[PDB]
Design a binder for this molecule. Structure first.
Ligand code: ZN
Lengths: 93, 59
RNA sequence: CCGUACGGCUAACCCGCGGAAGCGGGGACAGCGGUAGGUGGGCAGUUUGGCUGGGGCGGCACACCCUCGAAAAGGUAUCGAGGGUGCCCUAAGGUCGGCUCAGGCGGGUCUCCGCCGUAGAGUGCAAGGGCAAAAGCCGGCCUGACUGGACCCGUAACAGAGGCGGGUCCAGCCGCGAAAGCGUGGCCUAGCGAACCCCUGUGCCUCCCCGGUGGGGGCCAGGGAUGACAGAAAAGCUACCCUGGGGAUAACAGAGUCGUCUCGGGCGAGAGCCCAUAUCGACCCCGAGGCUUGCUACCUCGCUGUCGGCUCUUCCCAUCCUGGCCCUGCAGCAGGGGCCAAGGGUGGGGGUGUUCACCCAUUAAAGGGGAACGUGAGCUGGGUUUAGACCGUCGUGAGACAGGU
RNA sequence: CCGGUAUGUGAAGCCCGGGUACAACCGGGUGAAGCACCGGUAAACGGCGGGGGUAACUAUAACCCUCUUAAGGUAGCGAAAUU
RNA sequence: GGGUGAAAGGCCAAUCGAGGCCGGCGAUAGCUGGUUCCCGCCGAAUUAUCCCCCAGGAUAGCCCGGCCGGAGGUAGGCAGUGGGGUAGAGCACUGAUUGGGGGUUUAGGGGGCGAAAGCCUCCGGCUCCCUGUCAAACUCCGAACCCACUGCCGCCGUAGAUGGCCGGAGUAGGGGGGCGGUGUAAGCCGUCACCCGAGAGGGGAACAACCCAGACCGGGGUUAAGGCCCCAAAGUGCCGGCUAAGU
RNA sequence: CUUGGAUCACGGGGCAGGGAGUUCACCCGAGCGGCGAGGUUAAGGGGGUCAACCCCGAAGCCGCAGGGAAACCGACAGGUCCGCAGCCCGUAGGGCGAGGGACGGGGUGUGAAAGCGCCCGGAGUCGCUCGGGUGAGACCCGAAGCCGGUCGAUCUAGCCCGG
RNA sequence: GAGUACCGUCGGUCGGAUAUCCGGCGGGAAGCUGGGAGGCAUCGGCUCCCAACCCUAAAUACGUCCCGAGACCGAUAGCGAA
RNA sequence: AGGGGGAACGCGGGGAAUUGAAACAUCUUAGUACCCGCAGGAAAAGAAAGCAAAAGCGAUGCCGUUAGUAGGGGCGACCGAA
């Protein structure tokens, strides 16, 4: 499925239709200096069992699309509706 | 589960001990702070059967 | 300057001998302490779903859409009938303009002209519904598949709701169009998902007397998944088995029913040297009984749970012999088929736990059934369903077999 | 199960760089045992095949063609305590 | 969770697939059992959604007790404004279904005069005219009946309507009878809201739900269902006709 | 108990005595009572005829202002209408009308803003009793089993010593 | 007033959360021009205090006992035992 | 000099499971039952390297409140100070 590389949309900071580049969101991994991860680390310690659930191999056949739209006049990004599932996705002219 | 004979032998009960009170003594040579170079001389006097040696002993 | 791999030494430490003192051998390895990764049913704690004309194996009726069922408002179930979705599309999405389909007839040869044509075509994908100067095909310009927020309908009738879905609008920024007008994804009805946690975006609030830096917490929006789909992180044996309970639920006899079963009937095709009925009677149609087997699940889960045999008494007739009769394709001797008749009789043995079935020799003939599949406060105890053990198959294994001993 | 380990991966610690007026934190290097890899072992667990065609009346196939395995059940015994 | 075992899970003081004794311990259970005086007023439900839920719970519906507020409400009917696709009927669409006739010949396999894929047909097909049959998932038509609303009758209501607030429950196995789907049937699954459950009394010989009929106490009288030869209260009743089989 | 009991479903030989919704802590409501924009004391102290009685003690808790995650900001002791009771004029009806219902205006969060949500025009608190919910053994009885510490080999299993 | 304050790591425990207390292991100070605390770490300012040695009454908890009392039971009750 | 005894109260160590979460493993039960040691008529603590915040207090211990609060937690059931 084909989506453009640039689209003309409302920018709520400039408050008008500007041109926007389309970017996908790249997923990073958990941080260690967070509070939940700290909790987890101190609950794993010592003599225990395993204190949380561990679902191994749980996924959907297709996932949604994170998509950020970044203006050119100011360079700020924003979201444009909800997501939609498709298996293939390729950006074009 | 239950145990093995392997595992009960390691505790030292009459079912597993050796009856050494039935045997003739231990067999060692001589302590060598006594045998510097003196080359002791001795005489055999008896030959006997030991129930813990699979070999005869001699006095 | 920091480690190393290797050779060597003895003075720590381990071994031995010995009152001891020391002597010998090994040696910075080992052992001891602390930490890090692996292996690990040797030992533990637990899990191993539910619906289910019993249960298990099978399937999913365990999340959604359409037609029927469904009883001309609404609503309405079953392991009820018939089918589909767990996607695809920058166009198949918005608008503006122009034009009309499948099929056939008549020409021309193996896409060309004309005509009839209410849609018999097509619509991104099922079914149903909708649609013709179109909601279909041909094109031109765009990205309302947007932002901030209200209210209402459905799932879920009447009559409670989290999450999801749809609809009518206010404001902003925009597209198409001469204009009016339309446009908050796909003509309508399917294509998906809580809490906590994490990632991204944006711009603001906060961290223990004060003020700075680094790093942390919060509000708002989007996304990563739980298909048992209003969401546990998870395999099996028990015939050594225990408890608590159940006729809400099977095997066993009873009740109900009779497809199957046994015993019959109507009609007359045709066969019988010719002759429909001596005898046989098709194909089709109509029944009795409750002595087979099934279906259901109304009684009984500690009443008794049982098969066969022996002993003992009684009943039905749909009669095997014994008495009496009628038809014959009945010369006699006999046979075949039918009516009355239930007083009496219907036995002995071989292999098998057998019932039945098969076989022998006799006999007037050696009938079939019921009585809680009559009869264990009457016997026996061969079979079957405990605990022991063997074989064959299946299983990694514990183990199982409506398989044998 | 055993042996070998040239090579890959592989935890903590140590080393280098970045960041932090110090730390947390990020990245890389070194990198044992184990796994991966190469080999030996069945009086170790266990396993040891199909479809077709053919000889002087009929039968049968000593024989051949194929599909195929890590290897295709040998000697014996056989309706067996196994049919 | 240890011993011993020529191994049967065999023995360990009448106790062993993990002893006996006190303690944790008045362990837990959605499972079984029980729960103590009288009269009076009202009076149910076993069904929709969710739960590793199906012998159990929650949210609602159905009962009770109090109070607020303050004038309409509608379990019945008549007329009207609207909606609907059932029974029945029929072929105008979808699809099935007998046969005879025309007319054109062919999508195609049988042949001949096939002097050679044709001028001639086959037996099929295609268009019409008659004839004879169908529909739970068809409809050119189309009831009885059902629903919503408006107005009038009729009933309730100021001795307090529709309605609202606060509190206390029980119910999550239903069954007879009528209607529908499935099934050889028995039965299974639903629906209707009349009855049993939670309902005495009179009759059906006796009978949970079939007929009459809804019940404070003492007495009197007339009826219902049905009955009137004896049992057994009341007719060996009246007229007309049939049965000879104790039907 | 059950849809369903004279049941071939369970409990049921006779008499007498015993024998099952209790107590605490929090929460929701009511029937009464006291004070009232305020209400109420605890521990404790003093006095007495000394476990009864009397006086002091408001620390604290609830309430009088709400919104918002937070920083922070910070409201009507009545402007209009309809109108029950009751009162006035009367003779049916009409007027004022507390409490009750509906509008309007305001505070704050969210948002450019409009509009939406909560809130504002003075009634609460303190006690006795009762009904209920939650937790504690929680109306009464009933398990198989899980854990801890001690006792046992005069039975029976095995081994040693002496007969 | 030194294997002490402190720093990292492991185990336990706490309401103690990047911010409780105890212990093991490996490192480790200054010491009066000195040193510690102020709820993540660090810099500065301000405020409060001087650890790593010892003793100490009163107000408190109990009741195998005593005095004294009681909307307690009254011989199958009340303690198991009148 | 010690050694042994003593209901409950006391100081110091070791340390479960049933049960609840309608299963269960982190949690809960619980620093509980029970075990080991040491003291008394009371024991233990106790004289700031503290509390706090622009103001200040002045050793310990007990009651009433603070408060089911701050805060911990499959952020669940629940636990819980100064
Ligand atoms: Zn911009």
């Amino acid at each position: 499925m084909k989506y453009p590389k640039q689209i003309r949309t409302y920018c709520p900071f400039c408050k008008r239709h500007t041109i926007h580049k389309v970017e996908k969101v790249k997923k990073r991994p958990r941080s260690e200096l967070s509070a939940g991860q700290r909790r987890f680390r101190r609950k794993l310690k010592g003599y225990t069992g395993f204190p949380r659930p561990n679902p191994a191999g749980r996924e959907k056949p297709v996932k949604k699309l994170d998509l950020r739209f970044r203006c050119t006049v100011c360079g700020k990004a924003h979201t444009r509706g909800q997501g939609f599932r498709v298996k293939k996705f390729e950006l074009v002219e | 589960g239950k145990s093995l004979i392997q595992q009960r032998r390691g505790k030292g009960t009459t079912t597993f001990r050796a009856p050494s009170h039935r045997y003739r003594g231990a067999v060692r040579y001589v302590p060598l702070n006594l045998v510097q170079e003196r080359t002791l001389r001795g005489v055999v006097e008896e030959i006997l059967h030991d129930p813990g040696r699979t070999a005869p002993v001699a006095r």
